[PDB]
Amino acid sequence: FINKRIVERVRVGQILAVLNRRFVAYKGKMRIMDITQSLKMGTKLAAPTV
Amino acid sequence: TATREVDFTVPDVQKILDDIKALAAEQVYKIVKVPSISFRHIVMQSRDRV
Numbered sequence: 001f002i003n004k005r006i007v008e009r010v011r012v013g014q015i016l017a018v019l020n021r022r023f024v025a026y027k028g029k030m031r032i033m034d035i036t037q038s039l040k041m042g043t044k045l046a047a048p049t050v
Numbered sequence: 051t052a053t054r055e056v057d058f059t060v061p062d063v064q065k066i067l068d069d070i071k072a073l074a075a076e077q078v079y080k081i082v083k084v085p086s087i088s089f090r091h092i093v094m095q096s097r098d099r100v
Contacts, residue, residue, distance in 0.1 A: 028054060029054070030053070032051075033052070
């Protein structure tokens, strides 16, 4: 006994009845990039010497 | 990055400007001595109608 719907006999008329999740996608004309490694890009300032 | 591949090549503006300048010498009209034929006739076995 398992209280889950693993295998179910489904008519052809209700094949597409499982469409209930909202999906968000991005345009192909825009870019997505990861800038995690950009946090360590920097330079130090040396003190003047005489 | 994740985007469509676009080749960021640099063109030369001199040839483009020369082509734009040369485009101003084109002629949209034309000069002819006689107009084109606009009607034709088909004859049949009759001698009074075509």
